[PDB]
Amino acid sequence: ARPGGDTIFGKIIRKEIPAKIIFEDDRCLAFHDISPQAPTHFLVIPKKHISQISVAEDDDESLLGHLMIVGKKCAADLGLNKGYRMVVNEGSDGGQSVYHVHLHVLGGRQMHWPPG
Amino acid sequence: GDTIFGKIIRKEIPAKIIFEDDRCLAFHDISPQAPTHFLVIPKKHISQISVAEDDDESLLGHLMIVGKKCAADLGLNKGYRMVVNEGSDGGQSVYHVHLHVLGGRQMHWPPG
Ligand SMILES: [Cu+2]
Ligand SMILES: [Cu+2]
Ligand SMILES: [Cu+2]
Ligand SMILES: [Cu+2]
Ligand SMILES: [Cu+2]
Structure with a gap:
């Protein structure tokens, strides 16, 4: 079990598939989304593999x-x-398209309501 | 400055409360955009996520x-x-940080 798992996001964490990285620390990685829904659209992901927010632990x-x-x-x-x-x-x-927890951040235009 | 979410936290005006603890409050949105649409807000007055501190x-x-x-x-x-x-x-509709949670229907893409 390679650290971060083998979803595309785990592969990106381990530099096995390329990404346009904005920020990296020991806990997380921020990189641009390849299918942007806004003029700026990036993702912040933990390096720890958590499949989805519904199974996140209290800690x-x-x-x-x-x-x-x-x-x-x-x-x-x-x-x-x-x-x-x-x-x-x-x-x-x-x-949810990838089962590795990820935070979308979208901007550079007026976002509308409802949010989908 | 104070907001309507401060009034809700202080129980000065009603809301349909789902959950409360010592540091946050969850309640149904008054203008729901899905069959289930609620908010989770901190009791600490952080006006917007852009001014949240590391702590x-x-x-x-x-x-x-x-x-x-x-x-x-x-x-x-x-x-x-x-x-x-x-x-x-x-x-952002209220300058008190709040997490929307929406479900009970298919949510679509883009998210607004
Ligand atoms: Cu995996
Ligand atoms: Cu996603
Ligand atoms: Cu538009
Ligand atoms: Cu808002
Ligand atoms: Cu629809």
């Missing part, structure tokens, strides 16, 4: 919050001074 | 853990979407 709280802190810092570093939307998808109704 | 990281993660536990309790076994809006482009 994962700091790590999950760290994704949002890194997300808002990256958004500022990318000049998203008018704001942005953060999204976590869970399961089928959530539209 | 807030476990509190922010607590909102998500509370959110996913409430979603399971509300029967959202087919999934759901969590949303935090920042600023005007993000469509």
Whole structure:
């Protein structure tokens, strides 16, 4: 079991498939989404493999919050001074496409309501 | 400045409360966008995620853990979407950080 698993996001964590990386630390990785839904659209993922938010453990709280802190810092570093939307998808109704926890950050245009 | 979510936290105006602890409150949105649509908000007044501090990281993660536990309790076994809006482009409606949780229908892409 290679660290991070073998979803595309685990492969990206281990530099086995390429990504456009914005920020990296010991806990997480921020990189651009290849199918962007906004002028800026990136992902913040833990390096620890968690398949989906519905199975996150209570002790994962700091790590999950760290994704949002890194997300808002990256958004500022990318000049998203008018704001942005953060999204976590869970399961089928959530539209989750990769079963490795990930925070979407979208900006550079007016986001609309409802959020899908 | 204070917001309507501060009033809800202080129990000055009603909301349909799902869950409460010493540091957050979960309640149904007054303008729901899905068959289940609730909010998880910290009791600490953080105006927007862009001004959250490093020391807030476990509190922010607590909102998500509370959110996913409430979603399971509300029967959202087919999934759901969590949303935090920042600023005007993000469509943030109240300047008190809040996590939306939406489900009970297929959520679509793009997410707004
Ligand atoms: Cu895996
Ligand atoms: Cu995704
Ligand atoms: Cu549009
Ligand atoms: Cu909002
Ligand atoms: Cu629809």
